[PDB]
Structure formats: C-alpha cells, structure tokens
Design a protein around this ligand. Structure first.
Ligand code: DER
Ligand code: DER
Lengths: 557, 557
C-alpha cells in the first residue's frame, strides 16, 4: 500500500466518514450553530487588503477539521514545507530544489542550494528586468528602423505561457501606457499567423520563453517569427533589437541567434508551472510595469510567510488542502471547480488546471509504491455569472458532487452605473453558494407551485423537477480588491494548497514525466506524414488515421 | 429504481462489465484484430468533406457494442428521435416541442407544431436576417452620423452568447468583408466597460440577444450600452439605428425601446443552448456573411439526416452517446474531455460544457422518480497541443479515467512554412492517442534509463516514475477542413449525442429548472447590499460575507 492509506490518522478519518458523513447536513449545521461562520473562516489582514477564506459552507464539523489537522501533522507537512523553503532537493526524481518562494523572497534572507545563496542571482535578474522594462516602456528602446516598441509577443507553451497570460489578463487595468501584449503558444500555425498578421516587424518585440529552449512548439514558433522578421529587416544584427530570451539554457539561446545580453536567466529549481515569478514574468512586467510586478511578488511573499509561520489549524493553504483531501479521498469527488466572479480572472481556472493537475496528476509515491487511493482532481471552471447560465444546472441538479471555490473582489476596477453591475455580480456570488448549501425541499417547492396557481395535476407532475437537494459544499474567497499584490497572494495560496496535498499523498508535486513523455512522441510520426505511401508501422487506428489524412489533404473545399 | 436500471439490456451490460472489464486491454484488442480500425470507425462522406469518427481506441469489443446498441433500442431511442423531428412536445416539463432541427431544415419538408407548419416562419426570419446582413455588410445601413457600421456587439448570456461566440471564433477566416464582432455577456461591469472603451457610438451596432428579453444580466448590459450611446447621440430616435433585438418576446422588446422591424424572432421550441441556428445566430451571419451561415445550417441538416436515417449500429451521434453511457454508467467516469487540435476551436469545449451539462445535468426521470444512476458528465478541455504541457500529465499518469475526444481538421486555414506547423500539429494529435492507448512498458523505460547513463541505484528508483500504464481510451474525430458546413455537422453531431444520452437516462434534456433557485436568492440579496445596515436575514456565512463586503468596500488601497 501507500503512505496515506497506511496512515492510522487517515484510516480514522475514513472510518468516521463511513459512519457519520451521511448525517452532515449543511442547512441544519448552520441552524444549530450561530457561530458557524466565525469558527470556520479566516479573515486575513495583509496590510494591503483583506482576504476572507470562508470555508463554513463545507461538509465538516469541528471534529472533522481536528482529524484533518492531525493527519497533516502525521504526514509531516510542516517539516516538508520547511525543507522546500530551505532549498532541500525535494524534487527527488530530478534531484532538484523547489524554490519559486526564492523568486519572490522580498526579505532577502539567504536561501541556499548546494551551499550557495540564490538571492543575489534572483535579484540580479530582477534588476535586469526592471532596467529593460523602463527602456521599452519609456519608448527609449528602438526597433531596427528607429521606432518605439508598440507590441510585445510572448512565445512559449505551458508553464512558459499560461502564467504570463493569466496575470496580464487579470491585471489589465494596470497596463495603461504599456505596450500591447500578445501570447503565441500553440504549434497550430493559426496562432502565430493571426498574431503576425496584426503586427509590424518594425515595432514588435518577441520574447522567447522556454526553460529548456528546446520545446518543439516554442522553437518552431520562434523560428517562424524570426523568418518573418528577417524577411522585412534583412539584417541579422537587427534581431538583437527585437528578440529576447527567458531561459536556463544559454547555449541553446546563443544557437538560436540571441545575444546572451538579451537573455533573462532562471534556474532548474523553478518549475514551469511555478515560473511567472521569475524571468518568465517579463511580459507581465513590460505590460503593467515593474513596480506592479514587484507588488505581485510581494503579495506572494506575504502568503509564503503566512504558510510558513501560521499554526496549521489557522493556515489558509493548509485548510484548503485538507478540505480537498476530505472530498477527494473520503467522498471520492473527481473534480474541483474554480469559479471567479471576475471577467479579468477569466483564465484563472485554466492556470490552476495546469498548476494543480500537472503537479498532482501522479501515481507513484516517494517510496516507489503505486498509490491505492486518489490523487489530484480534475480542475475546471469559467467566470461567474456566465457559468450560472452554462453548467450550474448540473452543479445544482446533477448526480455529481463538485467542491467549488467561489472567488470575488469586493471593489471592482470598473464601478460603472454607480456600482450597479458590481452590486448584481456580488448578489449572484452570494446567492449561488447560499442556494447550493440550502437547496429547496419538496414542501418548499410545493408551496411555491401552489402560490403560482398550478392545478393539482400540473403541480404533482412538475414538483420533483423543482426540488433542489442542496447540501452542495463551497468555499467563498473574498478579497478587498484584485490588485497585483492581492493576486500574488491568491496565486501563492493555491500553490501551497497544491504543495500540501502532494505531501499528504506522498507524491512528487514538482516533476512531470507524463509531460516529458509527450515531448518524445511526435517525432516518430512526423516523417511518416510525408509522401503518399500507406503507413503500416503502428496499430490499425494510428495507421487508419494517417491514411485518412493522406487521402483528404489534397481535396478542394 | 429508474427506467435505465430496471432495463434488462442495461443489467446485462453492467453484469458483463463486472465480470469482464478487467480483460479489456486496448493493446491486446488491437493485436488480436487487424480489422479493428475498419470495424470500429465511421468514414462519413457529406459531399462537402469527410468526417472520420474513429472510436477504435475505446475499451469495447464487438459484443460490448452490440449490447450498447441493443440498450439504445430498448430505451426507445429510435421512437424518441422520430418524435423530436416530428414536432411532438418532448420537452414534457414545459410542454414544448424541441425543434432546433427545424431551424436548419434545408429540405423545407413541413414540420408541424399544433398542426401548423413552422417552416414558413423559420424561412421568413432567415430572409429578414439575410436582408439585414446585406444592409449592414454593404455599408448601406448608416449610423446616426451617416457612417457605415464597423463593429457589431452581441449582448446576451449563456445560450444567447456561447454559440455565436464559439462559431465566429471557429469561422474567423470566413469573415473578410464583415464587421468586427464583440461579445458582451457577464454582468461584471468589466465586460461592457472594456468593450465600449474600444468603440465609437457612430459606427457600433448592438444586438440584444434574449429569448425572454428579461434576463437581468442582458437587459442591464443593454441599458448600459444605450446610456453610453445616448450620451453621444443625444437623440432617442437614433437608438433605432444602433440597436436590434433577437427575441421571442415582442412586448418586452418594445418596452426597451427597439423598433419592432428591428426584431428577429424565434420560438419557444428553440432551446437557448440549441439556438445559434435561429435568429440568435445573427452575429454569425453578419460576421461571415449569410451564404456561410447557410452552409453552417446545411452541415447541421446533413447530420440531422444522418441521425434520422442511419441504423443505430453505424449512426455517429448514437455511437458517441453509447460509448459515453459505457464510461459513465459502467466505469463511473465523472468527466468527458473535448480536445480540439485547433486554435479557432478554442471555445468549442466551453460551448458543449453548456450544451451537454445544462441538458443532461439532471436527476428526475419522466415518471418523476429520482435516478439511481449517474447522468451527464462534467465536460472540459483546452486545445491541443497546449494541454500536453498542462493537464495531460494527469490524463497519462493520474488516478482518473477520462474519456477524451481528440478533434482536428486535415487541412489548416493557415498552411504557413509549407505546412510545417500543421504537420507537427497532426503528428502530436496522432501520437498522443497512441501513447494514451499504449503507455510505456517497464522494459521500454528501463532501456531509456540505461542509455541515459543512470546508475543502477538511480535507474531502480526512477523506473516506476517513467512507466505508463496506458489503456486510456479516446475518440479521434478527423475532418477534411473546418468549413462552415463541416462545423455545422460537428455541432449537430454532439447535439444528437446529448439527445440520445438523455433519452437513455429517461431525463429531460431540454428544460433547465436548476437555474431557478440561484435566481430567486439573488433578487433577495441585491437590495440588501445597499447602505450600511447589518444584514442578518440569512445563514451566518451569507451574513458574514455580506458584512465583509460592507466593511471592505470603502477601504482605500
Ligand atoms: O508546462 C510544461 O511543464 C512546460 O512549462 C512546457 O513544456 C514548456 O517548457 P519550456 O519552458 O522548457 O519550453
Ligand atoms: O443559458 C440559458 O439556458 C439561457 O440561454 C440564458 O439564461 C439566456 O436567457 P435569455 O436568452 O432568455 O436571455
């Protein structure tokens, strides 16, 4: 078996769930205890706004939370956290440190890897980013025909794309005066082609974002961009005014034709899905300004310190992690929905779909054992209120239990119509979790239909369809305003939630052998697509699909 | 007990699964049967391109498919389908016909509701749409200062938003000569504010899309748009030049102040999530032209005819439905992933999130009995190749079974670099489903670790982390090109998949009672947010969150 299932505190938790969970009814939990909100929420004062983590609408009692905290202690969460923060090589399959926390270590307390403090180099690259941002944003940096830069294009995929994309979308109001930012990621030629169609080579700056600098999609996209650029500029020296690199691989950057002076370095202990805090964040800093990028880092640092110093029973990422364990390993819920009531946060769910699933979508433990329990959930979601009109039907009246985190800023960036839109948005945010909790009893629906004027026949026909069973648990995460600082704190909070779950499951949150597999796969099929000859080298499906491609690719439509 | 679980063909299938499902291994199924692709795929010739539905990489034998087809028959799928097409009121809770098939009924064969052919009115509205499209696209339709329209803004939510958005995104290359299209949906004031910031009142035309014309989000957004417009135009009579309506409710359209000639009508038998084919698709027709809109309709009509005429055992939407039943009701898979290897299709998954989940996220059967089995899955996904770097880690190496549909056009709209990008994209599409099926054996990974120079100790430790169990089932759906016609067929195919699943579960795919409770509770909270007074009328969580909002909304950050 595996560490979690062999753990006596987990077996106690699970046994309690089997014996007692059917008796947990949210509506009744609240009625019985007027202090429920007070005892099952955290109001965090960061001194730059508050974050309220209200976990009271969860299927938990004091005893459940106690058992969960004991399990975290039994699973050695505190020691593991400390090991991450001190630069221990906790990425054991790759023998690497895990130090995204060093990237935003505003205190500058030394963090050592291999006896050497990483902070001087972290800060050197940040200084280089700051200087570069000033030069570009001021209009001082000129293109090959002597014009200021108007457009910045990040080329990268996965960890080198989604962070910068999500954050520049979320912090859009802070981009006034900054250059337009574009993200190219897919190898699909549509992505680069449609982007380049809107650009001038004279005023576009490309950012090639790649830890390895060998990823097929990114290097191919970069080469396509360079070819397009050089067709116009016709001068290799012009590349240095228009192409920069964010990477750990100096040799491959040089090979591509980028000046080492145009290279913004990061390190092997920065996981891609944890990399927006590093040089990978350059497009963020260019778009919103370095000061706002620093505020983002500072928010993360606040949350880092919260995670590091707070007792587990009052520790926000730990509690979120433990509630997840409860739903995943005791209730068996496959999914976790992230539902931010904020259009600017429209890529937040997608970001953590990567952050969570690539981290904890694992099945081998530190001991080499195959897990005999569930690990990471499927993470999904869309911003409210749109979701209410798309898939909430299923959340309310389907056959699935779906833990949801509802997120919203108190203050809107756009208080139009004297705040009318935000009032309605807030009302829906609140009402939805209330509804999921409370439901609507047959007798309550019966009274409603009676009042609506329905005949005894029509009422009886319609009744069961109008019943909401409720008891659907949510987190509500509410924050003063979505500033760069508060966003940094929220991202870091979920990063540490993911960390805690991974430790408890005894898996490595920080490798990605499935992703590494992917990068080895396409090479075998590529040459087989060339020419008209039939391919017989694979299974009949792969073969048949190739035959279809070859048969269909010359047809005129 | 419910209809499905009481069905003897279902009982046989479930019993077969219990006794035999451990014997099903994809690798073995292909090894034992060289005709597997040939017998477990459908190559559909539409006369406007081919659609290959390759379902061979699924955990099914000939016997399993036979059992599934028998179940579809004994659950009344053929009769239920015929009832939909004939205008029977199969939406039994609302007593409505279900006739999105009539909207695209290119044959013009009479379809009666209450003894009246609906086709004349369908065609009348289409004619009106065509005329309006000519007026706007030609530049003949002038704004209040006499200028041609350059921007169209659809305002709507859910069914009045996702379809038009997804289709205009997917068919972008077909929009030459068309006005720019914008989609405002969220009540969050960010959405309309950032949209209006980039527009001129002189050249913008708003399309107010609302079946009911009372949806709070849409009408509020519409009124905000009108306020912005009138600040510039300062003349209420100019509204008629810049606002049109897509509705079933003539009166409410008139109350808002729109010209009755500016109203594009649809009918109660057009479900919101099945509405893009109706007047709701006006923004599509404006963007890509009416001819292309007609091609979209014709593709759907082709698939309607395929669904209607084809024996179940070779009927594409039926087979897709049956595989889903197998994974949902026998394997217990909560989710279904849609993975288009196509940037233009980037909103396809979000569209069917509504189409699928709002239809089949249900728990009450036709008899009024509660289901005692799973219904609709959670639908999710992002375009390839991006997912390969992000959540495919979990698909390959997690603890969840996740049926995936991989979709791709053979021909790209942007064959840059002599087809290099598309070759790579196709190679990845093919290699990923192959790898999901095959995995990687210990003997294969061992040799890789050996060749990489890993020590005997390191190899031993790394090995299980590098092994992939495989046996992960997929569908591959490959089509000649993503044209308006082919896109229409693909959407219609999934519509009918959803229909078949709904009939088999004995649920109503066409109502949405589960949105009501959240709406009611939001109306109650809205006025409570105003002013400084404490709110105590709810549970302590709702009260506490409101208190936090009132306390935090005046804080200056
Ligand atoms: O998402 C993945 O983990 C990586 O970030 C992605 O494969 C890109 O890798 P690169 O930064 O080395 O190009
Ligand atoms: O998604 C829902 O089913 C509806 O389409 C949505 O609420 C919009 O309703 P309306 O078209 O009546 O405004």
């Amino acid at each position: 078996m595996a560490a979690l299932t062999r753990n006596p505190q987990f077996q106690k938790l699970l046994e309690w769930h089997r014996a007692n969970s059917a008796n947990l009814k949210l509506r009744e939990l609240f009625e019985a205890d007027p202090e429920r909100f007070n005892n099952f929420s955290l109001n965090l004062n960061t001194n730059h706004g508050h974050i309220l983590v209200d976990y009271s609408k969860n299927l938990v009692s004091k005893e459940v939370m106690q058992m969960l905290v004991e399990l975290a202690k039994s699973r050695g969460v505190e020691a593991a956290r400390d090991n991450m923060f001190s630069g221990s090589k906790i990425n054991y399959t790759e023998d690497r440190a895990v130090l995204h926390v060093a990237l935003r270590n505003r205190s500058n307390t030394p963090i050592k890897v291999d006896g050497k403090d990483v902070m001087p180099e972290v800060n050197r690259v940040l200084d280089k980013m700051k200087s570069f941002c000033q030069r570009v944003r001021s209009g001082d940096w000129k293109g090959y025909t002597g014009k200021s830069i108007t457009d910045i294009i990040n080329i990268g995929i996965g960890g080198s794309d989604l962070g910068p994309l999500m954050v520049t979308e979320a912090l859009k109001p802070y981009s006034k005066g900054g250059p337009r930012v574009w993200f190219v990621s897919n190898i699909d030629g549509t992505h680069i082609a449609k982007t380049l169609a809107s650009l001038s080579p004279e005023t576009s700056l490309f950012i090639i974002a790649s830890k390895t600098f060998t990823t097929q999609e990114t290097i191919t996209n970069a080469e396509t961009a360079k070819e397009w650029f050089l067709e116009a500029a016709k001068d290799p020296s012009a590349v240095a005014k228009h192409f920069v690199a964010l990477s750990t691989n100096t040799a491959k950057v040089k090979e591509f034709g980028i000046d080492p002076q145009n290279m913004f370095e990061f390190w092997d202990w920065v996981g891609g899905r944890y990399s927006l805090w590093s040089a990978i964040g350059l497009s963020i800093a260019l778009h919103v300004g370095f000061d706002h990028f620093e505020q983002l880092l500072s928010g993360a640092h606040w949350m880092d310190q919260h995670f590091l110093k707070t007792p587990l029973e009052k520790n926000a990422p730990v509690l979120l992690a433990l509630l997840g364990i409860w739903y995943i390993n005791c209730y068996g819920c496959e999914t976790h929905a992230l539902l931010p009531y904020d259009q600017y946060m429209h890529r937040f769910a997608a970001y953590f779909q990567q952050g969570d699933m690539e981290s904890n979508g694992k099945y081998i433990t530190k001991s080499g054992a195959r897990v005999d329990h569930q690990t990471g959930p499927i993470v999904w979601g869309e911003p409210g209120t749109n979701g209410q009109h798309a898939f909430y039907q299923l959340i309310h009246q389907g056959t699935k239990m779906i833990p949801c985190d509802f997120l919203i800023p108190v203050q809107t960036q756009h208080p139009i119509r004297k705040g009318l839109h935000h009032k309605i948005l807030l009302a829906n945010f609140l009402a939805q979790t209330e509804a999921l909790m409370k439901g609507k009893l047959p007798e309550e629906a019966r009274k409603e239909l009676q009042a609506a004027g329905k005949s005894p026949e029509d009422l009886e026909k319609l009744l069961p369809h109008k019943v909401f069973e409720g008891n659907r648990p949510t987190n509500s995460i509410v924050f003063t305003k979505l500033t760069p600082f508060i966003l940094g704190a929220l991202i870091a909070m979920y990063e540490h939630k993911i960390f805690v779950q991974g430790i408890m499951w005894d898996i490595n949150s920080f490798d990605q052998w499935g992703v590494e597999l992917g990068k080895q796969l396409a090479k075998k099929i590529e040459p087989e697509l060339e020419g008209s000859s039939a391919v017989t080298s694979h299974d009949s499906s792969t073969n048949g699909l190739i035959s279809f491609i070859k048969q269909q690719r010359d047809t005129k439509l």
